[PDB]
Design a protein around this ligand. Structure first.
Ligand SMILES: CCCCCCCC/C=C\CCCCCCCC(=O)O
Ligand SMILES: CCCCCCCCCCCCCCCCCCCC
Ligand SMILES: CCCCCCCCCCCCCCCCCCCC
Ligand SMILES: CCCCCCCCCCCCCCCCCCCC
Ligand SMILES: CCCCCCCCCCCCCCCCCCCC
Ligand SMILES: CCCCCCCCCCCCCCCCCCCC
Ligand SMILES: CCCCCCCCCCCCCCCCCCCC
Ligand SMILES: CCCCCCCCCCCCCCCCCCCC
Length: 272
């Protein structure tokens, strides 16, 4: 179904800002690829998977925001007499498109935290399995919910506003399940981590919780019946969430993985 973005006209500034958010984000994630490539070589073999997962998330995210950039350009047309970008008939832009690549991002971001906690073999795979089940169900139920956001925003001729709350609350339950799995992981790190590593692992959990929590906030923006300006704010919120949850989290986690590597006597990690 059409997202709230589809029912508004945008002045040049509003349209161009949002276009730049998508382009800039794509470029930043691609650049992140270089950092994770370099950091992988200095990480111990037992923690290198985390850096590799960050690379997978950067490519997933680049394609996410790349697609939003293309859909944004294709879904609106300059109307010279109005001096505004107006929605094209038969072309629907939706943030809902981002949900598909979340199927990669969410389980992977969760799993890489578990990897740096130092879980291996069956214990790692059990947690990956549970995080993938919870994560996929969170995203699918969320997707059903956001399908009805036009009705929530009071866009005339749209119904099913209750679906937004039903499936939103269901999705939130799956989110909490994921957070409880991860809380358990960071509370019970494997090996003999320093007090510094234990504290930094908990930091990583709470940073994931904080940045992930922005996504339900962006989900809820239709409640505020936004104008074009509110849509700009919503896409800024998503950009902060995307860059913080994927790249900044990735960098912070990579530094904990390097510390664990150094503590365990991996020389290239000590040198770095
Ligand atoms: C599985 C998902 C089924 C979702 C069906 C939602 C029906 C809502 C209809 C409505 O209230 O307009
Ligand atoms: C002592 C090392 C401190 C952490 C280094 C942080 C560098 C991260 C650079 C990421 C680049 C992404 C592109 C924007
Ligand atoms: C110290 C190691 C040497 C430096 C490595 C840095 C090289 C860059 C990272 C490698 C990634 C290149 C793979 C290209 C695929 C990108 C996908 C494009 C999506 C649109
Ligand atoms: C037009 C809409 C195309 C959507 C398909 C997704 C392709 C993403 C490509 C990203 C390039 C960078
Ligand atoms: C209904 C489809 C969703 C089921 C959960 C996704 C399965 C992934 C589990 C991987 C182990
Ligand atoms: C014992 C732990 C109980 C925590 C359960 C979490 C409740 C989920 C709420 C989701 C909807 C809001
Ligand atoms: C220390 C235990 C870890 C916390 C487990 C559950 C935390 C619940 C936080 C809910 C996330 C807020 C966003 C809800 C969407 C509305
Ligand atoms: C110690 C954490 C380093 C911060 C990472 C920032 C790199 C990407 C931010 C771009 C905006």
């Amino acid at each position: 179904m059409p997202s709230i973005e589809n029912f508004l006209a945008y002045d040049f500034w509003q349209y161009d800002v949002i276009r730049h958010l998508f382009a800039f984000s794509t470029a930043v994630f691609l650049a992140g690829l270089v950092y994770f490539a370099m950091t992988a070589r200095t990480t111990a073999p037992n923690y290198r998977l985390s850096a590799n997962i960050s690379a997978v998330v950067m490519v997933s995210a680049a394609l996410e925001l790349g697609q939003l950039w293309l859909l944004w350009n294709e879904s609106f047309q300059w109307a010279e007499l109005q001096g505004s970008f107006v929605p094209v008939a038969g072309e629907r832009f939706s943030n809902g498109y981002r949900y598909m690549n979340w199927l990669i991002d969410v389980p992977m971001l969760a799993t890489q935290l578990v990897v740096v906690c130092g879980f291996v073999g069956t214990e790692l795979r059990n947690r990956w399995a549970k995080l993938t089940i919870a994560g996929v169900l969170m995203i699918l139920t969320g997707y059903v919910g956001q399908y009805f956001e036009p009705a929530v925003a009071g866009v005339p001729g749209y119904e099913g506003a209750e679906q937004f709350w039903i499936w939103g609350i269901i999705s939130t339950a799956f989110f909490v399940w994921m957070l409880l799995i991860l809380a358990n992981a960071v509370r019970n790190p494997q090996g003999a981590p320093s007090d510094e590593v234990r504290s930094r692992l908990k930091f990583c959990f709470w940073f994931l919780l904080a940045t992930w929590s922005i996504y339900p906030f962006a989900y809820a923006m239709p409640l505020f019946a936004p104008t074009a300006d509110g849509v700009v704010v919503r896409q800024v919120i998503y950009t902060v969430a995307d860059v913080s949850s994927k790249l900044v989290f990735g960098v912070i986690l990579s530094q904990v993985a390097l510390r664990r590597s150094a503590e365990e006597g991996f020389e290239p990690a000590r040198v770095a």
